Design a protein around this ligand. Structure first.
Ligand code: HEC
Ligand code: HEC
Ligand code: HEC
Ligand code: HEC
Ligand code: HEC
Ligand code: HEC
Ligand code: HEC
Ligand code: HEC
Ligand SMILES: [Ca+2]
Ligand SMILES: [Ca+2]
Ligand SMILES: [Ca+2]
Ligand SMILES: [Ca+2]
Ligand SMILES: [Ca+2]
Ligand SMILES: [Ca+2]
Ligand SMILES: [Ca+2]
Ligand SMILES: [Ca+2]
Ligand SMILES: [Ca+2]
Ligand SMILES: [Ca+2]
Ligand SMILES: [Ca+2]
Ligand SMILES: [Ca+2]
Ligand SMILES: [Ca+2]
Ligand SMILES: [Ca+2]
Lengths: 99, 106, 106, 99, 106, 106, 99, 99
């Protein structure tokens, strides 16, 4: 996907998680997020260091998303949603820098 | 793309990395691999179509790609450091993970 | 020590790393693993006793430890960077290599 | 001073930045936050990677406070106010791990 | 502490490093230097007592320690890798910062 | 080249970096600064023409560029990681070395 | 083994390789070396950075030994012996520093 | 100057250090070697990791020449003479790879 979709996806599903009731909604939104992050982490100069640093921010995000999913799969719902709110830290870090 | 199609990409770009002289060929291959592994991570394989998406088998299948993706990330990182021979080695080790998933769900 | 004895050490210290809280426990375990893998690299396993030391099987057996040793080196490196959770993950992935050699020569 | 007293100064002054109106209270409050954070960056061993890690946390924190002061000093108060809120990320990140 | 004694601390340790044999010594010295630099950041030097805490000279004085701190950190890092010589030489480049500030505000 | 023009090159690029937006700019500037510094290493400045090539002042003059070079390298590295701000600020700390040498031999 | 043995081994087998006739003598001496390096790379403070840097020198050595063995296993004898002579570079690097 | 001319200066001056008697020829020859090596450190792309790698090679080489001069400057001629011989390691290492 287009990077803009990847952001729609991440942003949309962040909201879903916040509003979510049960664990199946959380797992499902985070899965969507994980994939968007993975796709955004791979795209089409031999490659600038701002590219390297950009890609790296997605890689962090993925790992964090992945931790959160793990909590949701363990059944810890409360804990998962908090991690999702903690992701914002990384979202804005990037946006500050590259936007 | 298709789960089959992803496996193709992985396998071609594995061979590209064996036969690669220079570091650009290897980044380029590994990146095409990562993209393929990312797409595959969401796929649902034949043998597990009858299973729940939440089944331990589907969990485990997803985990194999999570692993594979980390191994490509780690190999990428080497190729950036210009460590061609290392990155080709880290790539050859992927086959273990390829095989372990195949053994179980192919 | 004995090839069997090495496999013990590996397996105990694999479990230590699963249950480890702090980073010192994990370095300490991984180091005991490395030492064991190093000793094993020269060992000659039962199933291959009839083979030439220069046989492709013995080559391949040695290669599995060479691989395993690199994976412990790489996991060690993470534990030094204080990246406990990563190093425990890199450790769990060893099992693939444990298993691939076992499949063939155990 | 005491590490308890560092964390209090951090927390309190973070609140004062939330509440502040003009650049000078923000400049002042951050200046205090910085001191506490430099103090801080200084059963487990002295050499242990948990301490390399712990210290490195405050190194991040300091860089972030320095930036937020640089904004305050320029007169971008609002932008400084936000830089400050996002510090929490690092606070928590340490807390999650070592609180 | 006495701004003066922070400076005693910086100067003493500068020399310690200069004749240190091993890294553990160097880290320790640098770590004391960092502590001193941190405490120094807040101080008003006698030449600026008359001046506004906001004065451009106080900003410049503060910024001098900020540079100093950074350099100490960069030298610490060279020490943790065990590049003793490289740490020792970083630590000698600090003298430029010492001197620049001193030339303007001592 | 003209020692003077090396210094023109160092000064021009110092400013380039100062107002660069992206990293590719910064690397380029730093790389020119390195080239200039290298060529400068061999030069005799007018104030030392009278002196022995072995003279302690020529050693000290040479050593000033050696420091400078190192700092350029350390700033280059911050640039290749894409820490633009950090590179830009390293590059401002070079001014201390510029000034120290100038104060003594210009 | 004692580090002194590890050195006897490495030194003894370097000489053997130099004097070697056939590929089986080279493979065999390098194998002995590889093992000595591996053992020296693992031994019995939370751990000094000079220790880290020391261990690292062995790790380089192993990788080099391993390349050389590979050439010998391919049949390239001449090439292997040269690599063994190239190892000295690493041997002395360490000795300079730590001895 | 030309990169061919760098490598010649390096090689020739390396020979002059082998042959030298007093500190001044060693000091001089290395001084020349250093210049050539600083020149050098400066179909594949500009940004490529092969060039990061190539350059980094000469960075090593320079550090080694600097050390060997520092010995020469102290009057440890013999020790400088050996520091010089061991440079070959780096020469070859580059050569093996990029000659
Ligand atoms: C960089 C490493 C990023 C991370 C991590 C995240 N985002 Fe992002 N985001 C990034 C860029 C460069 C852009 C601008 C590109 C463009 O033109 O679209 C964005 C943009 C957004 C947007 C709005 C863009 C749009 O579609 O019009 C949103 C809503 C957004 N990003 C949300 C978002 C969330 C929720 C993230 C984490 C959970 C996140 N982003 C991470 C770069 C990066
Ligand atoms: C699971 C977690 C897998 C990992 C990791 C890898 N592969 Fe795979 N692969 C997997 C499945 C379930 C299948 C069957 C697909 C189907 O619908 O039939 C495959 C298939 C392949 C194939 C064959 C495709 C075909 O032509 O039928 C190849 C060539 C292949 N896989 C290669 C491959 C490589 C090289 C991998 C890692 C480097 C790899 N796979 C990982 C499941 C999984
Ligand atoms: C080959 C290259 C191997 C690798 C890598 C690992 N192991 Fe292994 N293991 C191997 C063999 C040939 C054998 C049989 C030994 C015998 O003489 O009987 C083993 C055996 C074990 C055992 C069982 C020992 C016993 O009680 O009989 C265990 C528990 C074991 N191995 C564990 C293990 C682990 C945890 C590894 C990696 C992390 C590992 N092995 C790697 C060959 C190889
Ligand atoms: C580590 C790298 C930390 C960072 C960065 C921050 N904090 Fe912290 N904090 C840390 C520890 C280990 C502790 C426990 C200390 C104790 O003895 O309790 C704390 C504690 C606090 C507290 C509670 C202390 C109390 O008196 O009860 C607060 C209020 C606190 N921390 C706030 C805080 C803020 C606001 C931070 C960033 C802006 C922050 N901390 C960062 C470790 C670390
Ligand atoms: C400003 C940004 C400074 C930096 C950086 C350093 N120093 Fe300093 N130093 C500074 C001042 C204003 C003074 C005068 C203090 C006073 O109260 O009169 C000093 C003083 C010293 C002294 C003399 C100390 C004494 O006991 O009288 C020393 C020996 C000294 N400073 C050393 C020093 C070193 C070694 C530095 C860097 C490594 C350094 N200073 C930095 C202001 C600043
Ligand atoms: C000694 C070790 C030096 C260092 C480090 C730097 N410079 Fe320099 N510079 C030096 C000398 C001896 C001279 C005089 C040259 C002459 O022939 O008279 C200079 C001169 C300059 C000048 C003026 C250049 C001109 O065209 O007249 C500038 C602008 C200059 N130097 C800048 C400069 C910068 C920006 C440096 C570091 C980044 C720097 N110099 C270092 C000796 C030394
Ligand atoms: C450090 C990372 C080393 C590498 C790589 C190599 N050697 Fe070494 N060696 C090292 C040390 C610290 C010592 C002294 C320790 C002691 O007291 O023994 C040595 C010593 C030797 C010796 C003599 C020691 C003895 O047994 O009396 C020899 C002959 C020797 N080393 C040879 C050698 C060779 C051939 C190497 C590479 C092929 C090599 N060493 C690497 C540290 C390190
Ligand atoms: C890379 C990082 C290098 C280092 C370090 C050294 N050399 Fe080099 N050298 C290098 C290259 C890519 C080439 C090929 C250049 C060409 O156009 O041929 C060379 C070449 C030489 C040559 C031959 C050039 C000729 O005119 O035929 C010599 C004699 C030479 N190099 C010597 C040399 C010495 C003595 C070095 C260290 C002390 C050294 N080189 C280091 C790349 C690199
Ligand atoms: Ca859309
Ligand atoms: Ca609802
Ligand atoms: Ca698809
Ligand atoms: Ca098929
Ligand atoms: Ca044994
Ligand atoms: Ca048994
Ligand atoms: Ca304190
Ligand atoms: Ca006093
Ligand atoms: Ca001493
Ligand atoms: Ca001119
Ligand atoms: Ca501009
Ligand atoms: Ca013996
Ligand atoms: Ca013979
Ligand atoms: Ca040139």
């Amino acid at each position: 996907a287009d990077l803009e979709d990847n952001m729609e996806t991440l942003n949309d599903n962040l909201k879903v998680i916040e509003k979510a009731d049960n664990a199946a909604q959380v797992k499902d939104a985070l899965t969507k997020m994980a994939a968007a992050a993975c796709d955004a982490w791979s795209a089409t100069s031999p490659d600038s260091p701002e590219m390297h640093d950009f890609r790296h921010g997605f890689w962090i995000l993925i790992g964090q998303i992945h931790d959160a999913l793990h909590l949701a799969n363990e059944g810890k719902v409360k804990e998962a949603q908090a991690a999702a709110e903690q992701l914002k830290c990384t979202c804005n870090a990037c946006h500050q820098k590259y936007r």
